[PDB]
Ligand binder design. Structure first.
Ligand SMILES: [Cl-]
Length: 375
């Protein structure tokens, strides 16, 4: 089902973000809970045996089950509809050795389910294979993501690669002014500060203070995008010794929903750092920690649904996310005569590390999720 599978998909991907985050420590990290959910669902089809059970358990749904793929493909068409003014461009690709004898009916079946095809390449032509892979991403992310560092691992022994790449760029329901954007010190998690550019805006924001069962307090602010189709939620720790990991490690779609129910509109002056960050992840370590170890093993991996004669296994599972946040009419050239604005009761300055979550409002899909430590 629709919002059902979107939630199983989002939750799984967040579970994947927790792993990437517990590894990144104090590095800025952008990730797409949706992306890794979309691709892993496709890979379910190329698996069999234990390698398949480990993934359907990790994700929480069999891709061949009634309404799973139909709901998933309906979702994709929704995100890529006409409202999306090139705000989010994505691409999911599975590259297998072309010389490999495939199972009778895998390609036809895969297409019917995803309306996409598994890519074939002759991995013996290393240079060609890598170019072909970094090129697919390019042409299919509207030229936003044209390279990968991980492809540098594709060699002769490679027979299978998984790739996922997303690009996201706002377009707020109410653009942050421009003349208001200014310099402001940001408190990095070590007492050190840096003069970073921040956007400012007074208006009626949807806010809520949030406490985790653990007792951590966060200022939660929802920031809508044009048409309320998307919303970027901001979870900024209360004091200063409050980590992001206290929230991100208990995060789910039901938690975002929770914020919405307790949310209220207060007239504040929001000061938000403008950030354009990029992260590339080697999904292997994080996927293994979620219980998916077999797929990465030379003798254990079981992809007999993609081909039954083979010593296969994913040689490279990765993701690349490019997130940008600005005024949306961002001249950005380092600042005329006047600047006016309506006054607000209080201000909410985001000058310390914080985490954000972008969601598809109609379905509550957790599209993007990050931890911004130093903009
Ligand atoms: Cl790139």
């Amino acid at each position: 089902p629709p919002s059902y599978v979107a939630h199983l998909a989002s939750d799984f991907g967040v579970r994947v973000f927790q792993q990437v985050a517990q590894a990144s420590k104090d590095r800025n990290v952008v990730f797409s809970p949706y992306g890794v959910a979309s691709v892993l669902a496709m890979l379910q089809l190329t698996t069999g045996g234990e390698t398949q059970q480990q993934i359907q358990a990790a994700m929480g749904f069999k891709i061949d089950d009634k309404g799973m793929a139909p709901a998933l493909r309906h979702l994709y068409k929704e995100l890529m509809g006409p409202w999306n003014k090139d705000e989010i461009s994505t691409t999911d690709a599975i590259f297998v050795q072309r010389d490999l004898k495939l199972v009778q009916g895998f390609m036809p079946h895969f297409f019917r389910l995803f309306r996409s095809t598994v890519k074939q390449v002759d991995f013996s032509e290393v240079e060609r294979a890598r170019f072909i892979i970094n090129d697919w991403v390019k042409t299919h992310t509207k030229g936003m993501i044209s390279h990968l560092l991980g492809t540098g691992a594709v060699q002769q022994l490679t027979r299978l690669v998984l790739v996922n790449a997303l690009y996201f760029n706002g377009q707020w329901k109410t653009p942050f002014p421009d003349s208001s954007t200014h310099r402001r010190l940001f408190h990095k998690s070590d007492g050190s500060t840096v003069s970073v550019p921040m956007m400012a805006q007074t208006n009626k924001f949807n806010y809520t203070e949030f406490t985790t069962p653990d007792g951590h307090y966060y200022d939660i602010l929802e920031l809508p995008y044009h048409g309320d189709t998307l919303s970027m939620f901001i979870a900024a720790p209360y004091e200063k010794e409050v980590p992001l990991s206290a929230l991100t490690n208990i995060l789910s779609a039901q938690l975002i929903s929770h914020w919405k129910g307790n949310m209220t509109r207060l007239p504040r002056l929001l000061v938000l750092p403008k950030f354009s960050l990029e992260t590339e992840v080697d999904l292997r370590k994080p996927l293994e920690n979620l219980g998916m170890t077999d797929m990465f093993r030379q003798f254990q991996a079981d992809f007999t649904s993609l081909s039954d004669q083979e010593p296969l296994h994913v040689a490279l599972a990765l993701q690349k996310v490019k997130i940008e946040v600005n005024e949306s009419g961002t001249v950005a050239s380092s600042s005329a005569v006047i600047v006016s604005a309506r006054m607000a009761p209080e201000e909410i300055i985001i000058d310390r590390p914080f985490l954000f979550v972008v969601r598809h409002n109609p379905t509550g899909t957790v599209l993007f999720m990050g931890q911004v430590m130093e903009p």
